[PDB]
Design a binder for this molecule. Structure first.
Ligand code: CNC
Ligand code: CNC
Ligand SMILES: [K+]
Ligand SMILES: [K+]
Ligand SMILES: [N+]
Ligand SMILES: [N+]
Ligand SMILES: [N+]
Ligand SMILES: [N+]
Lengths: 137, 551, 178, 551, 137, 177
């Protein structure tokens, strides 16, 4: 658990910051990019980092910000296209309760995104009540 | 027989503005409406059963979202019992710390907090905003667009904006399909003006997210939220879809905030008989609930609705105050046209300018208004000298600075050549030397050579369809002889990896140094405390053009 | 009364048509756009611009939502070409394409006050051009920094009024342009 | 090769303004100057021996006058030791009563109080002004003049000004000899617009006193005082001659105040190397010392001096604050042109407008500036609609109101026929019915028939040389069928007999009701307390022309 | 003594404001002015009134204001033209010490304006030191 | 150097003259008014306006004070007609009359930037007209609400410089053009 004192990570604990492929903040130089020793696949924020920031946000008195960072940590594992699919699925009149619940299961089982999975189940339940499911318009 | 006095007054620009008489039934009232709910909170077993006179059995998605995530239920009932006048007093009392305030406000209900600020006049509101603003240092945001979605111009104007002081810049498109080009131009120009300047491209949600995924933007701001369920619906989202979208941006290492603003529900048909302030309050709480760090409000694009009615501009400042008080970064509008009068728009601007906010303007037009694709900003390129003069007059840091033509010309040119090299490298419709020089000395698109829109539109879509990411831009720059700019682009990308700039009010200054509410905590405690314009910054603000030496 | 509702609009069978979807009060409760141009003249010109390109024009009235984007989408669903044109009583217009997100489009005209009858003819023409799957030059961008200062309040009010004719679940109605 | 961006900016009006670099040597620096003396006080046997680092042996007339009469020596040393930051905090703290402040401020030395307000930014200064303002209710003052000293026009414009809300109006002459006419016109018109409106005619000291003695003025404001002995001398007075003159006006039952303002010493050659604020502070204290109830300051007519240097406008608000803090009525300038920019002038006005002062403007031009004989006001007749709009936007009482052409025309007419009757009665160069109707629909002298200046100038001087007093005007009105106006003029006369309106900030409202700081004590105590725009006044301010009922 | 609770005199204690002719604020009607029962000679503020206001100003915490009102009460007795004469006499380089001292004696003995007389003597003494007497220019 | 100091100016003998009193730096440290008009051209035109009326013109330089009012007064006391014309190097002008309060006058021109050579000729002729004890139409009122915005700062500077040439107690000096 990091705290305000530990922030900014880039300044206080740069070593705490490692990428998906496991590269250092320093490894991202023009050269390593031109020689491809580092590529787009090495430049994604890790769920670890996001969780260190949620800790700092919590220490800064921002629980909701931390919660958001928590969910974000879970989503770093979800493919770009799948993220867009989920988001669209949550928009008004797009899905059926079943499809949302199905999205939830996938999030939890395939991605271990428990937090996000419950968020989606909650939406599903409320979407029924407030009529924002496919066919409700 | 006509009175010449009234004929002269009838020709006045301000009389061209749209004014209306309050229409309480359709929510066409800025604030303090009689249909607005009385503050109330009823909690059972850690779950709200009543919110502002409304029973949980009647909650809409907004009520549900707010009740469950937007209010600190631990102190909710305690604060509800507190006297609203006493609280409003605490907001402007220079001796009540911001850190003492936040725990109380973040526990208030939408109606409660609105009741509090409504006991205030604009002078007290400003006195409070200087203390409630999350980041200690105030900042500015500019619009960088043009009617032709011309990429060469965008790059140049962006470089100038960055040079004049803007720490956040935003572009958008006349023709959607152009987006990728605008975004890249904006991002390239900005970094040339000042490495660290964050950039955004305002598009339809799904589209903007993908553009951020491809690496052509630094953050996103126009991630909309609304005050009523039916309007949120036509907005094509729910509190949950937006909350999810907010976490998605963060998972890619991108800073973001929501956008709202008084009058949108009215503009979209369903105000549900509530005042613009109450409904905006719900948006502010929707934002807090989602875990989003900041919010762009203060009417923004619907500024014409609250300004048409009594106390409209006072309501705009009040919503900015609700935002900051709720411990959220606030990009305080002052980015949209609402009047033909210079006097009138100046008054509206000073409400945030004087006390200072995270972003005094969330869209000061860095190009003349004829090129502003958000249908006009409350300030534009032609007001630059006046803005620096007001800064000098009142010794107020407006976030900008006087600049030399020679410097502007240089930076604008370097930004045109840089983008030219980017376009050549990525094999995009070429940027000719004519376009480069044109962009170097232009004031707007009128000064720019006509481009092959149909051709650009093609390659623009290709960047999307073939998922061409920002690395292609970094390499094009490097091989184009712009090692420095490529590195800078790289450094901005490294910021996304660390997550520091995802915190409240964060911007990047100096040498890749994040400046947020976390490491730049506002510590206002009355005169001679908190942020004060001084030192070299003051010297910078003082040296405006035309200042002659009497000797 | 130049518009007559003739039963629920059905999906188009041939790709040589463009649907014009208008708000629930278009030609009814409201008869002119934000700056006085009669609805009849507007539709006529849009129709003209479409046919002028060799494409058929089919007009329907949407009720599920008064929002111009959704009105257009309800329309592009029934369009044999997938291209439609949404128009609110106050004038706001959009060129939509079946398959695009609701709040996305091919071309948008965000400042109703600036549209002229020539503009409406141009819109119908480009729509018909998109139906023929061509890549027409976009209709020139119209932008007036003072548009909102002068008409936003009116715009909101007209929209407030048209929205009163919104009916949830009520599918589009094809119209007979008298 | 020039940048079209800077060519566009170069054409801007703001760039026609006069700007200069600080010149510390000649006091060409607004405030916080290095040459300014450090606060100090040394009292021996009840008499100051040292004032702000200066020994009594070196006191000039100002030091002497200030030291002997301007400082409450009983608490002087006590307050001197208090922390200036702490004091500045008390000024803006909504919870420190004005009544608790005054005893401390009126005990400070010029340098001390200047040091205090200098720790404040303009938002803090406004927050303090709303509390320090002597009269609880804010008011306004207008200029009523024209380039031809045409009396018919003045009476008409005066009646309108009074109708629009001005509680004090002032006129002056292009050609001195005209004075008696202007003064009478002003007095007559004002009473027709609203009985109770106080009137003055700004002339050379001795001349103005006689005009008051003859009964053609209600009060006097331009009774000047200066910050340095040399400049005061060129002003043709000393602290004693002006103190004497102050008591002379009072002995005739006439209300009065002094006039000063930052930059005058510089404008007149001897700033003695001090900052404009320090010198202005001396004037404020001279005013206090003399026993004068109020002061017209905030640079006033020399606005172009402090405005040309850094923090000039902030200094202007500072002096207004020093004035009110010293328990003096403040007519806060906003009456003189200093910029070609509407943005810039609006910012300057909002400093006093927003918080409100005894007289937000001590000279809002009630006629188009081409007719303003004070070389132009910061606002004029053509800004009336904008002023009412900003009142509506911010829910701020600016002291004025929207009016109907029909009413204005009627009032302007009744004022022209009234004066016509007066001129006929006193047997002065006649006012033709053409002039009457002309004045009824004019916007300025351009719409007025040319008068025989040489003939009026004669009869004007005759009124003086033959000591023709205001009773002649009262009778002419009565015999002219204007019994109403005649009694009104008599009622004004009654006020001088009772002396109520001689008190701090006094004006006459409603049915000859004095409204001063004595019976209308400002009781600001934060939000929901003190003066608040509301009730019928709010409705009055809300109803501006163009407010369409949304139906 | 007159208190702030007694202000406005016109409202609280009208009878306190009467002329030396026992005339009241009400006798000042157009009628009595047209019939001359009331003249410019009946319309001057009396030293009594001014002293009532000085009391009120003192009670309002404004001693300088009351002092000014006291001097004014003394000057109500000095002729208009004499007032003008004195004022001018006090302006820069107008008089000699003797003339000022002479004005002072006149004020004190002829008008019994004790306070104003001292004010002038004070000026005279300082005018010498600061050089603002005739011939000092 | 069109001006030469010819000893302390003496009181006027006949009422057929009008005195032109100019600041201590007029024609010296400063040679043009606030808007560039050469002092020589101004003086020449004022003199012309004077004589064109049949009156003699006598030019003097005041030192006791740089204030235009007092400069004019120093002059009206030596004027055989009692009328004088004060002019500061920056241009400000005033028509004074012996016996009038220092800060009073017959005609004043408070906005130097608006004065043209034609105006200065008008000044001189009305002065000569006043010396003949006539009642001339006052010179048309010139007023520019932007005059101060553009020139007050400059005005103050110029005056600050001319005031450096003020000498207490030093009586006026007769001038030769
Ligand atoms: C005010 C405004 C503007 N908006 Co919006 N907007 C808004 C607000 C009012 C819209 C409303 N539904 O009432 C507000 C904040 C809610 C909004 C919202 C959005 N907007 C959006 C976008 C992308 C845009 N908006 C602009 C039109 C952008 C405009 C800038 C511009 N270039 O004009 C703008 C600044 C001014 C328009 C105006 O006042 N015209 C004057 C008025 C008198 O004429 P009018 O005909 O009545 O105007 C209407 C249309 O402009 C319409 N409208 C506004 N935005 C859109 C977007 C789409 C896709 C559609 C179909 C219609 C609209 O609403 C107006 C009032 O009813 C845009 C050009 C600016 C930009 N680039 O950000 C751009 C369109 C891009 C394109 N397709 O080519 C959003 C999709 C953003 C998001 N994050 O979701 C969203 C869509 C809402 C919806 N359901 O329609
Ligand atoms: C700024 C100003 C103005 N002033 Co004064 N003034 C002042 C200030 C600066 C003057 C200075 N001495 O440096 C200030 C506050 C000190 C002042 C003072 C007075 N002023 C006075 C008066 C009566 C007038 N003033 C105006 C000229 C009234 C002006 C209104 C107008 N219509 O012009 C005015 C608003 C603007 C002039 C300006 O800036 N022009 C632009 C500038 C670039 O041109 P400039 O040629 O250099 O301006 C100079 C003259 O205006 C001159 N001046 C100003 N007032 C007077 C008065 C007299 C009698 C004389 C001879 C010269 C002046 O001073 C200016 C700078 O040095 C006047 C027309 C309007 C008014 N009532 O304010 C009026 C003259 C009436 C007439 N003769 O027809 C006082 C006698 C008032 C008093 N309470 O005693 C007093 C005289 C002071 C003195 N010793 O000269
Ligand atoms: K923005
Ligand atoms: K005034
Ligand atoms: N967006
Ligand atoms: N909102
Ligand atoms: N005066
Ligand atoms: N001053």
């Amino acid at each position: 658990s990091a705290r305000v004192s530990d922030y900014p990570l880039a300044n206080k604990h740069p070593e705490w910051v490692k990428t998906a492929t496991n590269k250092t903040l320093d490894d991202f130089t023009l050269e390593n990019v031109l020689s491809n020793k580092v590529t787009a696949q090495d430049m994604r924020i890790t769920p670890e980092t996001l969780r260190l920031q949620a800790s700092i946000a919590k220490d800064a008195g921002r629980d909701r910000l931390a919660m958001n960072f928590e969910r974000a940590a879970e989503l770093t594992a979800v493919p770009d296209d799948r993220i867009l699919e989920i988001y669209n699925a949550l928009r008004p009149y797009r899905s059926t309760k079943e499809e949302l619940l199905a999205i939830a299961d996938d999030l939890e089982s395939r991605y271990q995104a428990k937090i996000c999975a419950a968020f989606v189940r909650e939406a599903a339940t409320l979407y029924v009540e407030r009529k924002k499911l496919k066919g409700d318009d | 027989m006509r009175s010449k006095r009234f004929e002269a007054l009838a020709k006045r620009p301000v009389n061209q503005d749209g004014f209306v008489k309050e229409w309480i039934e359709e929510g066409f009232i800025a604030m303090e409406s009689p249909n607005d709910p009385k503050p109330s909170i009823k909690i059972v077993n850690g779950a709200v059963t009543e919110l502002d006179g409304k029973p949980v059995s009647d909650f809409d998605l907004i009520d549900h979202f707010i009740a469950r995530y937007g209010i600190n239920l631990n102190r909710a009932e305690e604060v509800m019992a507190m006297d609203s006048v006493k609280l409003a007093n605490m907001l402007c009392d220079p001796n009540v710390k911001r850190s003492e305030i936040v725990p109380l406000t973040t526990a208030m209900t939408p109606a409660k907090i609105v009741e509090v600020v409504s006991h205030m006049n604009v002078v007290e509101m400003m006195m409070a905003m200087q203390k409630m603003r999350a980041r200690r240092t105030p900042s500015q945001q500019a619009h960088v667009t043009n009617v032709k979605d011309n990429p060469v111009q965008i790059a140049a104007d962006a470089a100038e904006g960055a040079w004049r002081g803007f720490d956040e810049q935003e572009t958008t498109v006349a023709v959607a399909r152009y987006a990728p080009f605008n975004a890249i131009a904006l991002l390239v120009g900005s970094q040339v003006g000042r490495p660290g300047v964050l950039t955004q491209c305002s598009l339809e949600e799904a589209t903007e997210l993908k553009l951020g995924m491809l690496g052509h933007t630094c953050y996103a701001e126009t991630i909309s939220v609304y005050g009523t369920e039916p309007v949120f619906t036509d907005g094509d989202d729910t509190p949950w879809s937006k909350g999810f979208l907010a976490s998605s941006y963060a998972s890619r290492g991108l800073k973001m905030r929501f956008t709202s603003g008084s009058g949108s529900e009215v503009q979209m048909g369903y105000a549900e008989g509530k005042s613009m302030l109450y409904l905006e309050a719900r948006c502010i709480y929707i934002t807090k609930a989602a875990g989003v760090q900041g919010l762009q409000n203060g009417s923004v694009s619907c500024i014409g609705v609250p300004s048409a009615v009594p106390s409209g501009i006072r309501a705009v400042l009040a919503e900015n105050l609700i935002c900051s008080s709720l411990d959220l970064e606030c990009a305080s509008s002052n980015d949209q046209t609402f009047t033909h009068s210079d006097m009138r728009r100046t008054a509206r601007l000073l409400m945030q300018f004087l006390p200072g906010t995270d972003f005094i303007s969330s869209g000061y037009s860095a190009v003349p208004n004829y090129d502003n694709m958000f249908a006009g900003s409350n300030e534009d390129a032609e007001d630059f000298d006046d803005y620096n003069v007001i800064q000098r007059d009142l010794k107020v840091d407006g976030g900008l600075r006087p600049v030399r033509e020679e410097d502007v010309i240089a930076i604008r040119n370097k930004a045109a050549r840089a983008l030219q090299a980017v376009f050549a490298g990525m094999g995009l419709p070429p940027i000719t030397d004519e376009e480069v020089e044109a962009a170097t000395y232009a004031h707007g698109s009128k000064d720019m050579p006509e481009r092959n829109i149909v051709e650009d539109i093609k390659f623009a879509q290709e960047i999307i369809n073939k998922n061409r990411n920002g690395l292609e831009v970094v390499k094009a720059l490097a091989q184009g002889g712009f090692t420095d700019v490529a590195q800078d682009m790289l450094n901005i990308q490294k910021a996304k990896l660390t997550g520091d700039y995802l915190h409240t009010s964060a911007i990047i200054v100096g040498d890749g140094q994040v400046l947020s509410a976390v490491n730049d905590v506002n510590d206002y405690a009355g005169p001679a405390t908190g942020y004060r314009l001084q030192g070299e910054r003051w010297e910078e603000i003082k040296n405006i053009p035309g200042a002659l030496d009497p000797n | 009364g130049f518009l007559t509702e003739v039963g629920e609009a059905r999906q188009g069978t041939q790709q040589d048509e463009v649907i014009i979807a208008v708000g629930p009060a278009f030609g009814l409760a409201q008869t002119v756009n934000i700056v006085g141009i009669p609805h009849k003249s507007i539709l006529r010109e849009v129709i003209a611009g479409i046919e002028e390109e060799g494409i058929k024009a089919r007009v329907i009235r949407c009720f599920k939502s008064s929002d111009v984007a959704f009105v257009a989408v309800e329309g592009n669903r029934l369009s044999g070409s997938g291209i439609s044109i949404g128009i609110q009583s106050k004038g706001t217009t959009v060129i939509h394409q079946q398959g695009l997100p609701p709040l996305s489009n091919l071309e948008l005209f965000p400042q109703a006050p600036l549209l002229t009858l020539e503009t409406y003819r141009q819109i119908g023409k480009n729509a018909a051009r998109y139906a023929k799957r061509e890549s027409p030059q976009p209709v020139p961008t119209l932008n007036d920094q003072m548009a909102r200062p002068k008409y936003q309040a009116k715009s909101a009010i007209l929209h407030i009024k048209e929205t009163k004719y919104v009916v949830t679940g009520k599918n589009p109605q094809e119209l007979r342009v008298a």
